[PDB]
Design a protein around this ligand. Structure first.
Ligand SMILES: [Zn+2]
Ligand SMILES: [Zn+2]
Lengths: 366, 452, 653
């Protein structure tokens, strides 16, 4: 007997029209987090584990957990490749006390997202089997090279899981295998997953809101840190140049990529096996030599030397120009950002866009 | 009612100038601003090619120019080509050996060039070194004044009190066919075209209203080219800056007085030689207000799926317009509530208003909260609004001459062949040997029927 | 005097001579004084009781709850909502414990305009006396109670009321169970006295006349004298949140708060009623308009309650009845509200029923019962608690006097949006196939001024071909679909040519059940044809799509009632545009178009999504009947050769 009277004017005079001013911070956000100059698992094999159990039908979020999960998964899949084309993805669904590898080890969002679209039709059935899921995953990761960061991300919806044997078998194996596992839980903290994640070197987090769900996923987009226990390798890599059918396709037959059915007349050949690949980067399914484009390498070098947060202040007390450096414009906002090194004037968009998207400060390049 | 309902033929710049004489257009192209107005109105197809060709005096071959656009878009490029040539912008010149080279009218070329870079005149603009004017007028005061003036003209069509206008302007409203002369003394009355105009948006309204003024301009002895060039210079003017009436012909002075009375320009006094152009004049161009609430001023009609209209408007004019096609339910100080219904929309339809006018009228005035969605008007409303006219716009009338019951099929096939020969065939029935021909062929075919 | 006639029937505040402007709108700019905070105040309080809300306002959440708790909902489109104040809506707010000051203050605070004095007067008239006092019935003791002694002191000054009070006290309890001794806790805000058993009937008139209607509440739990039948819900019964709140609204205080509950067609209405009966655990009387409801309740009780065939008994002249050892009498109003005995079976049952004291009365169709029948029934049974179940708050028999006050305030209202947002009721695609009239049928349509015209709009090939396609489409989707029509020959000719099941009155129960079972459970029969009998209780099965072969028809509400009665959410399809569909087929330029228009309007008024159809893919791209002029002619001649009787409206029974 309180909801029709729950407005701010229920027991106040000024709240009759200042109610949305008193409760004005109702829907906003402001994303930022820390960083560190530590080794990163730039070569990344991340596998996604998603509950396929009846509990995924619950409406803890706006739509059922399944729809909200798949919605954010697609977005996460996109940015994961976008921020690391070198890495690869795979998906496993934990249904009927069993686990089904929705997607194999690959780096093609086309196939991965296509699988998601189709996976929207899945049937939430039975209880989850964390042991079966980790079995299929580890069985696959066993064959992956030690230097490639073998990681798994788990999305847990239920609280009870059917394991055919104590998961300590897998955790002891995973720890010895140096594989890393992280888990994202829905509405609750489970000891099983917490111990599993903390012991395995990953982290257990719980979803609060779709924004929090993105906030957590955002952290998993950045490559994990690496220790000296992982193989510090000197992996062989190919940088094949694109080659069209320039000579009227002469002595250059069109061919389908190892992964694709599209017969491409021009593209990237394998310097190791001369295979035809329409896209790059692509792993040589018939050689083991990975082929990567020179710009994709530089695309990740920001993680090696990222920017630092700029000095924030409510006013340009330093009395720089009335026009914000970088992007020209008036200091219309009573909050200013100043680079520690170059000390130029930066605005809200500069601190956000330059540090989170440009990753380079103009005055530091000078 | 031998033909369909009278429609307000909205003729953009192309349709209007497309009928003018080349010398008139050449005189018009005399000013740099007139060229820019024409140029900016061109489709992006023409817009780029003209800019690309502006710096050449060599007749580039028709084929090479046409081969600048991809195979599939070359067909759409023909539209811009037909326009540029039809608008005298493109004139063919012959390369050695008679090849079809293309050249832009040098006057237009030179004025666009003088528009982009210095020329003998500095855009025909100057400050006259005068200081800040007496009784300074502010930009918002200019807008409101222009708005008030425009509202007064719309109010005059609505026939509301205090709508003060000159009889020559009231006459023009009747002369243009907007205010019907159904009664002596010209009491407030409106034609289908006038209602369509009332529901039309401000820029297209002002544009077509001024086109009617121009259609009567030489009947009124005013200078078409001069007024047009002046109007284009005004469209390229600035709100806050001052402009002078120094060196303006009496024809321009008469028009300027109308232009002032019309609220497109603000003057210190009717006799003053310095003025400030209003937002309406700068925005006076053949363009579109938008698919939702107007960019310049937001909409106020909250159209709802239950056909309920919640117009956050105080304006008796806007309210009275809504009453034309919708049945009004309540009047509240800050907002008005009405509902669209078959009867009220059939009133608009019977008054000769295409449902698209209502749809667009509501769209252009759709409250900003209704935005942020692809369809601003729910499909059910859009469909039923159209369905109401499609219910009662199935009967289509057409005046013609019928040829029937000939002596044989040879007569029918001969008359049909003659109708086909002259292209005067409207419709025919080959089973009963019936043919309908345009009325122009009435005498020709009636007399031929005696000869065949 | 028990209906609280003045605010309900007199409606003092309804304007006359309204200042309607030239545009036809009510000019309330002067009546509703302008007030500031046009952007922060989300309400408009029109002097005619209508209220408007902004769904985009920042306080919409609270303002919606506020209007939902105070005013009847009218329309709830995406950006604006409409609500209407009524005595019953206001009394429901008062019974919840809301004060006239709080209501007036929050209204004035949320209204963009000052509240009109006429509405403020209506608020006073409907809040000061409307429910300040309660009539408790615990331990068979009629205790009159009010939160404020001020109200009862005034009431107690009435000499007739004083003659009703009984001097009695209530005891405590022993250490075996001294909670009844600890029930002396919270005697603050609590003052009550017993009234003589027989004075209640007269005292009610006196209190309502005195402007102090009694909120009657039956303490079924502590009532020791009326024996319990150990009634309990089967584990199959799971309460949905709206059902749980509806029961919470009723049993929130602990006693059965008598009143009317409104649940839209398709809700687990029976589950709420069975739960209420299972909660009361006392003998219950149930009333419906047909023996069908009686056995429909009985079957639903069997599936959700422990009550046996020795305990559920039917009592309706259509069937044999069993007073001996009955525990739940389920019965028809027209039997009980008789003017004179129907039979010796009325001597058997009505004298017996007049003698029993049912602990709870459940009305399944109170929104359809006339004042006289309801007044007779209420006078005869004299049940300790009454619960009114309704499909819609506005009753076709409401007319001048809102009989709802006889039962009490509205207890709960399940919002269409909450049911759709939670899938309890599917989103129904309302659509009308406006078929162009055929030239030949147009000859006969204008020439046949008599009602034989009905077949012409019904048998148009365009209507048949579209019907055939959509049926085959819904069959391809495997949607359960039912086809209804106003005429024998039409429905026969359709179902026969379509080679689909058709049900009529002569259809024997086994022949009927063969179809029903093969439709309800066998996935083969996707489409079935049902006669005009479907307009009423004919044990219609469950379906996901419904098509009206004729948009000609009766009451819009009865059509809407039928639509919800049959339509059910298609399992697993709730993500689609719609998971329920309704169609009504219309002949352009015919008498069907008005009922079509009025249905279209009434649907959008009720908030249902609507569309119009003329042609869709397959309507010509597929093999459909009457594709040739001759077959169209044969159909039209068979229609013309059919008598007026075969063309007239099919009987509903
Ligand atoms: Zn290779
Ligand atoms: Zn810097």
């Amino acid at each position: 007997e309180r909801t029709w009277e729950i407005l701010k004017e229920d027991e106040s005079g000024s709240l009759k029209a200042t109610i949305e001013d008193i409760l004005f911070k109702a829907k906003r956000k402001r994303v930022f987090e820390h960083h560190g100059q530590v080794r990163l698992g730039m070569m990344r094999h991340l596998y996604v584990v998603v509950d396929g159990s009846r509990t995924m039908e619950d409406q803890d979020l706006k739509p059922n957990r399944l729809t909200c999960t798949l919605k954010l998964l697609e977005y996460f899949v996109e940015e994961y490749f976008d921020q690391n084309p070198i890495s690869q993805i795979g998906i496993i669904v934990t249904k009927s006390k069993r686990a089904e590898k929705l997607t194999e080890l690959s780096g093609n969002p086309r196939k991965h997202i296509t699988s998601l679209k189709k996976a929207v039709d899945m049937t939430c059935h039975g209880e989850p089997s964390l042991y079966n899921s980790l079995s299929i995953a580890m069985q696959t990761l066993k064959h992956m090279p030690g230097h490639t960061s073998r990681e798994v991300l788990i999305i847990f919806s239920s609280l009870t899981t059917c394991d055919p044997s104590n998961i300590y078998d897998l955790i002891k194996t995973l720890k010895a295998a140096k594989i890393r596992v992280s888990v994202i839980g829905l509405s609750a903290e489970v000891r099983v997953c917490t111990v599993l994640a903390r012991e395995t070197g990953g982290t257990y987090h719980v979803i609060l809101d779709e924004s929090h769900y993105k906030e957590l996923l955002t952290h998993h987009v950045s490559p994990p840190p690496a220790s000296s226990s992982s193989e510090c390798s000197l992996i062989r890599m190919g940088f094949p140049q694109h080659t069209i059918a320039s000579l009227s396709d002469q002595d250059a037959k069109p061919s389908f990529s190892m992964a694709e059915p599209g017969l491409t007349l021009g593209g990237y050949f394998c310097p190791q096996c001369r295979a035809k690949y329409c896209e790059l980067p692509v792993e040589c399914k018939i050689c083991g030599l990975t082929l990567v484009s020179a710009p994709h390498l530089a695309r990740s070098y920001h993680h090696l030397f990222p920017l630092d947060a700029f000095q924030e202040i409510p006013l340009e007390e330093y009395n720089g120009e009335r026009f914000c450096y970088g992007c020209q414009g008036e200091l219309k906002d009573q909050h200013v950002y100043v680079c520690a090194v170059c000390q130029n004037v930066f605005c809200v968009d500069c601190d956000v866009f330059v540090h989170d998207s440009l990753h380079c400060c103009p005055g530091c390049i000078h | 009612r031998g033909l369909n309902r009278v429609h307000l033929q909205c003729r953009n710049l192309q349709e209007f100038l497309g009928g003018l004489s080349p010398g008139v257009l050449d005189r018009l192209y005399g000013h740099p601003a007139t060229c820019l107005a024409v140029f900016r109105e061109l489709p992006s197809l023409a817009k780029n090619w003209v800019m690309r060709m502006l710096f050449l005096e060599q007749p580039l071959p028709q084929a090479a120019v046409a081969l600048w656009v991809k195979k599939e878009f070359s067909k759409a490029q023909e539209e811009s080509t037909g326009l540029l040539s039809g608008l005298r912008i493109w004139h063919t010149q012959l390369l050695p050996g008679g090849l079809q080279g293309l050249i832009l009218n040098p006057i237009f070329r030179q004025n666009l060039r003088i528009a982009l870079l210095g020329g003998g005149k500095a855009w025909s603009d100057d400050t006259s070194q005068l200081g800040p004017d007496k009784h300074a007028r502010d930009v918002p005061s200019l807008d409101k004044y222009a708005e008030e003036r425009w509202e007064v003209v719309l109010h005059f069509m609505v026939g509301s009190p205090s709508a003060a206008v000159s009889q020559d302007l009231a006459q023009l409203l009747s002369q243009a066919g907007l205010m019907k002369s159904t009664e002596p003394g010209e009491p407030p009355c409106i034609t289908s075209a006038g209602f369509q105009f009332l529901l039309l948006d401000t820029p297209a309204q002002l544009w077509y209203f001024m086109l009617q003024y121009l259609q009567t301009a030489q009947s009124r002895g005013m200078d078409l080219v001069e007024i047009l060039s002046f109007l284009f210079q005004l469209s390229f003017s600035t709100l806050g800056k001052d402009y002078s009436v120094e060196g303006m012909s009496d024809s321009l002075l008469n028009f300027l007085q109308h232009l002032r009375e019309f609220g497109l320009v603000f003057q210190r006094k009717r006799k003053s030689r310095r003025y400030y152009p209003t937002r309406l004049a700068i925005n006076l161009s053949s363009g579109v207000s938008g698919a939702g609430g107007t960019v310049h001023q937001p909409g106020f009609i909250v159209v709802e799926t239950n056909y309920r209209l919640y117009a956050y408007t105080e304006s008796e004019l806007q309210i009275a317009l809504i009453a034309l096609f919708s049945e009004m339910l309540y009047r509240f100080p800050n907002m008005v509530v009405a509902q669209v219904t078959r009867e009220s929309v059939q009133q608009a339809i019977a008054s000769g208003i295409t449902a698209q006018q209502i749809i667009h009228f509501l769209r252009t005035r759709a409250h900003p909260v209704m935005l942020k969605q692809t369809p601003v008007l729910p499909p059910t409303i859009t469909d039923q609004i159209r369905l109401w006219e499609l219910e009662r716009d199935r009967l289509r009338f057409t005046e013609g001459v019928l040829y029937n019951q000939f002596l044989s099929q040879v007569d029918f096939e001969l008359l049909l062949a003659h109708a086909r020969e002259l292209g005067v065939l409207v419709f025919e029935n080959s089973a009963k040997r019936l043919m309908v021909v345009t009325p122009a062929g009435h005498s020709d075919v009636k007399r031929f029927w005696k000869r065949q | 005097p028990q209906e609280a006639v003045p605010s309900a029937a007199g409606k003092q505040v309804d304007e006359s001579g309204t200042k309607v402007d030239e545009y036809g709108a009510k000019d309330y700019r002067l009546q509703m004084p302008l007030k500031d905070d046009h952007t922060s105040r989300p309400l408009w309080v029109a002097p005619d009781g209508h209220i408007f809300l902004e769904a985009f306002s920042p306080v919409y959440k609270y303002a919606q709850d506020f209007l939902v708790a105070i005013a009847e909902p009218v329309c709830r489109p995406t950006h604006v909502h409409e609500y209407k104040l009524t005595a019953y809506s206001l009394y429901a707010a008062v019974s919840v414990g809301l004060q006239t000051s709080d209501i007036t203050e929050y209204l004035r605070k949320l209204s963009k305009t000052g509240v009109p004095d006429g509405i403020m007067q209506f608020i006073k008239l409907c809040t000061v006396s409307y429910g300040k006092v309660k009539l408790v019935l615990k331990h068979n003791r009629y205790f009159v109670e009010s939160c404020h002694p001020d109200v009862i002191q005034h009431l107690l000054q009435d000499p007739v009321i004083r003659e009703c009070r009984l001097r009695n006290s209530e005891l405590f309890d022993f250490y075996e169970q001294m909670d009844k001794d600890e029930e002396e806790e919270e005697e603050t805000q609590t003052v009550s006295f017993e009234v003589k058993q027989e004075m209640i009937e007269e005292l009610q008139k006196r209190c309502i006349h005195l402007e102090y209607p009694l909120l009657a509440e039956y303490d079924f739990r502590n009532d020791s004298v009326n024996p319990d039948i150990n009634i309990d819900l089967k584990p199959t019964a799971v309460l949905r949140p709206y059902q749980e709140k509806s029961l919470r609204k009723m049993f929130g205080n602990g006693r059965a708060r008598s009143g009317v509950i409104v649940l839209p067609c398709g809700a687990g209405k029976s589950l709420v009623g069975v739960t209420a009966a299972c909660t009361v655990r006392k003998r219950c009387l149930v009333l419906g308009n047909s023996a069908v409801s009686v056995e429909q309740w009985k079957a639903q009780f069997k599936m959700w309650s422990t009550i046996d065939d020795s305990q559920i008994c039917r009592f309706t002249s259509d069937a044999k009845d069993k007073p001996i050892g009955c525990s739940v009498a389920i019965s028809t109003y027209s039997m009980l509200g008789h003017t004179t005995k129907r039979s010796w079976e009325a001597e058997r049952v009505m004298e017996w029923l007049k003698t029993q004291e049912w602990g709870l009365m459940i009305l399944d169709e109170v929104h359809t019962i006339p004042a006289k029948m309801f007044r007779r029934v209420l006078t005869i049974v004299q049940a300790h608690c009454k619960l009114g179940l309704t499909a819609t708050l506005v009753r076709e028999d409401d007319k001048i006097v809102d009989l709802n006050f006889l039962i009490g305030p509205k207890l709960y209202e399940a919002n269409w949006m909450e049911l759709q947002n939670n899938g309890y009721i599917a989103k129904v695609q309302c659509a009308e196939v406006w078929c162009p009239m055929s030239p030949e049928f147009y000859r006969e349509y204008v020439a046949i001024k008599t009602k034989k015209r009905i077949l012409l709009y019904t048998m148009n090939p365009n209507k048949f071909r579209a019907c055939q396609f959509l049926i085959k489409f819904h069959e391809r989707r495997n949607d359960k679909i039912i086809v209804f029509a106003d005429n024998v020959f039409a429905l026969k000719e359709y179902a026969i040519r379509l080679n689909k099941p058709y049900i009529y009155g002569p259809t024997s129960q086994g022949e009927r059940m063969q179809i029903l079972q093969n439709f309800k459970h066998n996935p083969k029969i996707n489409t079935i044809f049902i006669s005009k009998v479907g307009d009423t209780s004919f044990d219609l099965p469950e379906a996901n799509v419904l098509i009206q072969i004729s948009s000609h028809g009766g009451s819009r509400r009865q059509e809407a009632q039928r639509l919800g009665r049959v339509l059910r959410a298609k399992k697993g399809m709730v993500a689609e545009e719609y998971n329920a569909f309704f169609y009504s087929l219309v002949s352009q330029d015919t008498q069907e178009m008005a009922y079509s228009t009025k249905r279209q309007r009434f649907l959008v008024d009720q908030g249902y999504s609507f569309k119009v159809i003329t042609k869709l893919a397959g309507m010509e791209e597929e093999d459909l009947a009457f594709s040739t002029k001759e077959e169209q002619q044969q159909l039209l001649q068979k229609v013309l050769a059919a008598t007026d009787l075969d063309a007239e409206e099919e009987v509903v029974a």
